[PDB]
Amino acid sequence: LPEQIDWRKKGAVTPVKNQGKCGSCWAFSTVSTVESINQIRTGNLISLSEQQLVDCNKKNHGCKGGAFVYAYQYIIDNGGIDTEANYPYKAVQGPCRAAKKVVRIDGYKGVPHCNENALKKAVASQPSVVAIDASSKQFQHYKSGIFSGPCGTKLNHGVVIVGYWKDYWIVRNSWGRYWGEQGYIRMKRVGGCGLCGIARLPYYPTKA
């Protein structure tokens, strides 16, 4: 496995987005991994719709929260997801609109829990979604450098790992460019269930 990898440098990641005052991180994180796997498999980088999930993914709760599994499942069952351009983000749940099926995935797989070595292996293949505890003030006000806590392991926020280094994970957040390092945060790799519990619940989409 590569000692380091950054999917942003491989053209598989779209510009940082902002979920605003809506609890839709479950959608932004999941959609991000779908945009990435599509580019890795087809060579085409397309920005997809988070708003579609917020409005139509009924198993989840719009701006009130949701789970990775139901998001990926919705995309699969629905036969695909539309683009950001055709179904723009409003930061508020609204009536589910009819949408085009531009990008599709075949399934999704979970990574063994609290095993950063396995997580590293998955990230080396494609960006993966993970849940973390983002309740600490230190995390919410992070600006730069390698974050090393403090933070607990109570899962309450969804983000995406788009790369790594020997000592840290490169994490893509959905709070816009003005948070952290242009929307990203480097989190120290500490083993066990990971910093802020980042290794507790990882998943990635699959596409033949």
Q: Which of 38, 56, 114, 157 is catalytic?
A: 157
Q: Residues 76, 206: contact at Cβ < 8 Å?
A: no
For the record, the structure tokens of 192 come out as: 């066990």
Q: Is 57 a catalytic residue?
A: no
Q: Residues 26, 71: contact at Cβ < 8 Å?
A: yes
For residue 110, the surrounding DSSP H or E stretch is strand 107-110
Query: What is the SS3 assignment for 128?
Result: strand
For the record, the structure tokens of 120 come out as: 């590293």
Q: Which of 38, 151, 173, 196 is catalytic?
A: 173
Q: How far apart are CA 20 and CA 72, in angstroms?
A: 22
Nearest to 81 by CA among 47, 49, 117, 121: 49
In sequence order, the 6+-apart residues with CB closer than 8 A to the CB of 42 are none
Bridging pattern class, strands 203-206 and 146-147: unpaired
Query: What is the SS3 assignment for 207?
Result: coil
How far, CA to CA in Å, does 131 sit from each of 49, 90, 96, 97, 128? 20, 24, 26, 28, 10
Q: Which of 25, 56, 114, 196 is catalytic?
A: 25
Q: What is the CATH number of the domain that holds 178?
A: 3.90.70.10
CB-count exposure of residue 12 (10 Å: 0-12, 13-18, 19+): buried
Direct distance between the N- and C-terminal alpha carbons of the chain, in angstroms, rounded to an integer? 22
Q: Residues 25, 61: contact at Cβ < 8 Å?
A: no
Q: Residues 47, 102: contact at Cβ < 8 Å?
A: no
Q: Is 115 a catalytic residue?
A: no
For residue 171, the surrounding DSSP H or E stretch is strand 168-172
Provide the residue range defining the domain that includes 197: 1-208
Q: How far apart are CA 204 and CA 130, in angstroms?
A: 9
Q: How far apart are CA 76 and CA 188, in angstroms?
A: 33
Q: How far apart are CA 134 and CA 131, in angstroms?
A: 9
Output Rg (C-alpha) for the chain, integer angstroms.
16
Query: What is the SS3 assignment for 74?
Result: helix
Bridging pattern class, strands 184-188 and 146-147: parallel
Answer yes or no: is 196 a known binding residue: no
Q: How far apart are CA 25 and CA 176, in angstroms?
A: 12
Q: What is the resolution of this structure in A?
A: 1.9
Q: Is 61 a catalytic residue?
A: no
Q: How far apart are CA 149 and CA 143, in angstroms?
A: 13
How far, CA to CA in Å, does 11 sit from each of 35, 37, 38, 179? 11, 11, 11, 22
Q: How far apart are CA 187 and CA 194, in angstroms?
A: 9
Number of domains in the chain: 1
